[model samples]
Target chain A: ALRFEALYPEGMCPGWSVVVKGKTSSNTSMFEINFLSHPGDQIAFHFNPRFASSRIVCNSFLANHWGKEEVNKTFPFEAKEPFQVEIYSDQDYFHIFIDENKILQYKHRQKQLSSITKLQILNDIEISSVEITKRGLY
Target chain B: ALRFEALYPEGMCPGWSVVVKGKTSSNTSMFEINFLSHPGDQIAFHFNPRFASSRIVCNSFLANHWGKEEVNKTFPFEAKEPFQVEIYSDQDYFHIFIDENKILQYKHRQKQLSSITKLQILNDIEISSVEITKRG
Candidate 1:
């Protein structure tokens, strides 16, 4: 399953920077965002953008509940900034961002890193300076 | 260790119920909820007092994302009027509850129930009833 890492925090695409596409899954809209990662890995997202904006969850039942505070809360690692979000199964311990800033720092475990399964980065437009790291037992 | 059983929407307490408490667990204060179960059992919870409000993840920080409505989403259930949180883990089924709304139903598999380690209910409150079920 995909998880969040960071958003640009400014301009048109505020939360993250990556290739933008539209799709859907499990009855949820593709308008949200997707990424590719294994189950049981811990996913985190950081948004310290040069601009102010936000993103929403895939479920429509929760859209009405969205508020601005949720956007402000993801700042600089606030309570909602971004921590480890487990995908499926509860056995693995994969971490996405290494330090407090949610910077890319993949650690090597006994297993080699697999390509992210469903992650989709969004920016003002399609850009690819995106840095991703994968490590595990070689 | 002190897994909750009932008071589905409520923490571990009495009146409303669920089961799963260590020999020396208590009622009142507050608790951190976790999941576990037994055989043939069904875990369930619902608001006891009905009107009494309870916090889903009181600390929020541990899981709920500090009360942000959008960032707060999970299943098994949702926060609407008042509901219960339950699970089934055992065949014989036992119950444990906190506050007045939660409830639990569990059963044992393979090993005898006594062989399992008793779960310790974590909290800081006083106690009331401690009825040991005499089931076969």
Candidate 2:
């Protein structure tokens, strides 16, 4: 039962990124990384990797509901193996990568990008270090 | 001969931070990190580690002049050994920490804090990674 959450402090916008580093245990089930709105109700981006299903699901919770779940069948994870995940934002999408391989992209569901002020991680994955950085261009 | 430079994009105010990860080589003499203005003339904060003399000097360059240098006698770096430096700001100062030990504080020399937009690192160190983050 791993859980983590934090404010963006100054909110998040284009050119910003989050780096999550850690390894999952042998019995890991599922894990998530979320980019949330200030009020905590809207989820601009939800990244869920499920070991049981062997798939990754990403979506948005806006307008008091989820729009659509964009699914990826190509999974990238291993038991007891360390992983480096980089998630960065541009004007149109959230680009996700795992261990230097591009995973998927989630289009922004909200109009105000910078208004997304929180980053949350939940369940099963062991996190060693999390770096929230302004990836050079910013 | 290593060098790096970037803008704060949105500029930096209180509650923002920078993480510098690197190491000095055997032949390294010195290195510096400077927070500069938009036009790149003023250096709001300058952190220099001199391996030859075993010292760390931090200062501000504003009004076309470098302010009084705040010197630290304690040097926490070794040749070819990695180091983690966390430098963050609060209401009045930049707190510097090396490998989790509090080193020294550099107070702001200018009233317009956010006016400082660029970060530059210069000379003699091998950098592995540099993260300009909002460490909160």
Candidate 3:
């Protein structure tokens, strides 16, 4: 469960994006993206992409119990290969893209997008860069 | 044609990706992505997505002439909507994904991936961001 945590203190809103670049470990079995309101707890978006099962799993963790899993069959990644992933959020759903292409849509199970102030990226991968940006009003 | 350019000083190699994020203009008719070996000169891959014709066109510009146009009919974009496009290169072809789904493939007519040192993004849109990275 080794991971890197970044504080998005201002929170995520519409027109905001999180970009991740990394390469899977040679023996990687899985990786995850967690949008948390608290460090190591209270996740609003728990996105797990498991190579072992060839599935992308999305869930929410609240009050110590996990919510229903939203599973998607498409796996747009390769083991030991480099990948770039982008996640953008709107008022409704969390839109996820792999290699810059839209792949998954997860509704706001917890309903407070702005409370997602921490980002947790963990598991079998070598991260090259992580960027968070908000589209300006200009 | 309004264009944005980047100098890939060392050129692009396999396992590299170029990402563009933008919102099509309210009256957007088309947009394009071109990988050039030489700016204003040789193009290795020219990707054009036309809303008017509902087509995705791809081709190569070499020896001062455009090669045959490869067209795909599946259009995944809407006018005035935001789009995220990813263009990745492997050994054989350029793999293109629209919004996050694989949409088209353009073979390496120019063959030398490293020769692609410039990227040109042009046409009807308001760009939000452009990012280029190569996996180590």
The number of the candidate with the highest lDDT is: 3
**Candidate 3 lDDT over residue span A1-138, tens digit each:** 544454434465556787888878855488998888744459888888898888999999988889999999988888988888888888887889998788989988877667777667788766765565675322
lDDT of 1 by residue, B35-105 (tens): 22222221221112111123333211212132321111221222232222322234354343343333433
lDDT of 3: 0.77
Candidate 2 residue runs with Cα over 4 Å from true position: A26-28, A136-138, B1-136
DockQ, all models: 0.01, 0.04, 0.02
TM-score of each: 0.19, 0.54, 0.51
Give the per-residue Cα lDDT of candidate 1 at A23: 20
Q: lDDT per residue, candidate 3, B1-136, as tens digits?
A: 6445554444665667878887777554898888888455487889988988778899998878888999886888787988899899998989999878999887889977777766777788666666666756
> For candidate 2, what is the TM-score?
0.54
Q: How do the candidates score on chain B by TM-score? A: 0.27, 0.90, 0.92
| Alpha-carbon runs more than 4 Å astray in model 3 | A1-134
The candidates score, on chain A by TM-score, as follows 0.26, 0.91, 0.90
Q: What's the best-to-worst order under DockQ?
A: 2, 3, 1
Clashing pairs in 2: none
Quote the RMSD, in angstroms, for model 3.
12.5
